[PDB]
Scaffold this active site. Sequence first.
Site, PDB file in Angstrom:
ATOM      1  N   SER A  45       0.779  -1.229   0.000  1.00 53.70           N
ATOM      2  CA  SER A  45       0.000   0.000   0.000  1.00 53.70           C
ATOM      3  C   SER A  45       0.821   1.294   0.000  1.00 53.70           C
ATOM      4  CB  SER A  45      -0.959   0.027   1.192  1.00 53.70           C
ATOM      5  OG  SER A  45      -2.058  -0.821   0.933  1.00 53.70           O
ATOM      6  N   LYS A  48       0.260   3.841  -2.780  1.00 52.91           N
ATOM      7  CA  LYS A  48      -0.918   4.719  -2.862  1.00 52.91           C
ATOM      8  C   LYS A  48      -0.547   6.213  -2.739  1.00 52.91           C
ATOM      9  CE  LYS A  48      -3.825   1.031  -1.267  1.00 52.91           C
ATOM     10  NZ  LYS A  48      -4.352   0.304  -0.115  1.00 52.91           N
ATOM     11  N   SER A 105      -5.940   3.243   3.793  1.00 59.31           N
ATOM     12  CA  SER A 105      -5.403   2.165   2.933  1.00 59.31           C
ATOM     13  C   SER A 105      -6.510   1.402   2.186  1.00 59.31           C
ATOM     14  CB  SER A 105      -4.478   1.206   3.711  1.00 59.31           C
ATOM     15  OG  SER A 105      -3.379   0.839   2.883  1.00 59.31           O
ATOM     16  N   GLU A 141      -5.121  -3.788  -6.843  1.00 62.11           N
ATOM     17  CA  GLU A 141      -5.479  -4.338  -5.557  1.00 62.11           C
ATOM     18  C   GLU A 141      -6.444  -5.517  -5.789  1.00 62.11           C
ATOM     19  OE1 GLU A 141      -4.169  -3.855  -2.670  1.00 62.11           O
ATOM     20  OE2 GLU A 141      -3.276  -1.851  -2.602  1.00 62.11           O
ATOM     21  N   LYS A 209       3.006   6.438   5.158  1.00 61.72           N
ATOM     22  CA  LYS A 209       2.090   5.473   4.591  1.00 61.72           C
ATOM     23  C   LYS A 209       2.739   4.148   4.835  1.00 61.72           C
ATOM     24  CE  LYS A 209      -1.589   3.920   2.547  1.00 61.72           C
ATOM     25  NZ  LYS A 209      -1.407   2.753   3.400  1.00 61.72           N
ATOM     26  N   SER A 210       1.961   3.197   5.341  1.00 60.64           N
ATOM     27  CA  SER A 210       2.519   1.869   5.539  1.00 60.64           C
ATOM     28  C   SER A 210       1.911   0.859   4.580  1.00 60.64           C
ATOM     29  CB  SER A 210       2.330   1.452   6.992  1.00 60.64           C
ATOM     30  OG  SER A 210       0.937   1.416   7.271  1.00 60.64           O
ATOM     31  N   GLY A 211       2.508  -0.330   4.536  1.00 60.56           N
ATOM     32  CA  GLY A 211       1.925  -1.397   3.790  1.00 60.56           C
ATOM     33  C   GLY A 211       2.161  -2.715   4.487  1.00 60.56           C
ATOM     34  N   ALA A 212       1.306  -3.666   4.174  1.00 61.45           N
ATOM     35  CA  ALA A 212       1.527  -5.045   4.612  1.00 61.45           C
ATOM     36  C   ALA A 212       1.061  -5.911   3.481  1.00 61.45           C
ATOM     37  CB  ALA A 212       0.743  -5.342   5.876  1.00 61.45           C
TER      38      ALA A 212
END
Length: 263
Positions: A45, A48, A105, A141, A209-212
């Site tokens: 993510s 984004k 997210s 996505e 901004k994080s992602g997993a």
Amino acid sequence: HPETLVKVKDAEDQLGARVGYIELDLNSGKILESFRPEERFPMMSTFKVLLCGAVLSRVDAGQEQLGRRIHYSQNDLVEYSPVTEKHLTDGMTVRELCSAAITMSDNTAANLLLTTIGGPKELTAFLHNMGDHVTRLDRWEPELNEAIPNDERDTTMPAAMATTLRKLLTGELLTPASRQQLIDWMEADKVAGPLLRSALPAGWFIADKSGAGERGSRGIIAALGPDGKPSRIVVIYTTGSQATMDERNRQIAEIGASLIKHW
């Protein structure tokens, strides 16, 4: 400071996984510290932010309006769409979709936005044009979070991501307004608690901004600094770990803690 690299290497040992790391001076753009700067990692993510930069670039050029309402249906909804799932019947404006993509997210929001700009191919072109020749989006996505080992699709390198984030938040690429709008979305980040925010001293600025993703993938991109102003960019990615989410978050938070301590 190399003391921060200690923590990065600790994270590698603890997670059984590669960790990529960049600390970049926001003003000069000098890489202050690095670990696997030119290795590929899945963006998850974190893409984004780039997506919404591309959207704002279009807004700047008169090709898009933040206030334009986008309509969609149950056919469009993917996994994890907390905001979009609420406004199926109302639709959402481009503004609201970027807010949702970045702050929440929201997966569907990101898909809808991708469509307006011409898909992952045009996001990649945009990025290439702005001087990022390695970052690539190829999928939508939720498939983009698959994190298949040795798969280059939907990857970045920490060094390129850091440099791209700097160009977006503080370069000439976006107008001063669009920059600040991108920053605003990032500053309101509502899911990124456990990573860098959890270690940030009171009074500090953070736009992140994080992602997993699958296969233990986790990451975060951030502009941060003291006295309520950003002065550095941090990029942390990891993939391959079998560690729990809490275990991965703790490791990422420890690197955060170190770069703050050694600021």
